[PDB]
Each structure stands twice: as C-alpha cells, then as structure tokens.
C-alpha cells in the first residue's frame, strides 16, 4: 500500500479522460473499460457540422 | 484506523 497507490492516482486520472472525451457513455464506459468491454456504437448521436 | 496520507 502506497505502492498499489501512487498509480491509483495515475489510474483514476486516465479514467477521468475516457468518461470526459466521450460525454455519451460517460460514467459507464469507464466501468466497461476496466473489465475490458465496449459499448454498442449505433445508439449514440453524433455531430455533422458547426458554423 | 488511520492514514499517513499521500501529499
């Protein structure tokens, strides 16, 4: 302990970006990411253009 | 039940 931690600090920060870079599936893909699972792609919307 | 804390 403090050796299993000091990467938990590193490991929780990468967990923050996977649920932030993809706001949809957020707070659930991190759950699946830890176990090595993936979300179904077709449900989510996506953006076409911005002006 | 205590902890030296990491900081």
């Amino acid at each position: 302990d403090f050796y299993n931690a000091q990467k938990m600090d590193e490991l929780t920060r990468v967990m923050r970006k996977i649920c932030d870079d993809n706001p949809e599936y957020g707070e659930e893909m991190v759950l699946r990411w830890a176990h090595g699972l993936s979300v179904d792609p077709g449900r989510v919307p996506f953006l076409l253009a911005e002006k | 039940a205590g902890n030296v804390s990491l900081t």
């Binding site: 931690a5 938990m8 | 205590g2 804390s5 990491l6």
Partner: protein
C-alpha cells in the same frame, strides 16, 4: 420526452472550465494509504 417548447441556449464555456476548478476533489488523487495498528 415531455418537453414541448424551445430550450434555452448553451454556453460556450462554463465557469468551472474557465478556472479549471472542481466542486469536489477526489480522495484517491494524492490520497490516503491504509495503516496497520492493532
């Protein structure tokens, strides 16, 4: 699904994002390590 009217606009930058703050820091980052003391 019950909305039936136009919605308000969306900000281009939140206050927290502007100052890169956080409402509640996590307890794991710079966190606590268990101590044995029986």
């Amino acid at each position: 699904a019950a909305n039936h009217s136009t919605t308000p606009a969306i900000l281009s930058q939140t206050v927290l994002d502007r100052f890169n703050g956080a409402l509640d820091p996590d307890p794991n980052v710079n966190g606590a390590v268990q101590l044995s003391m029986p």
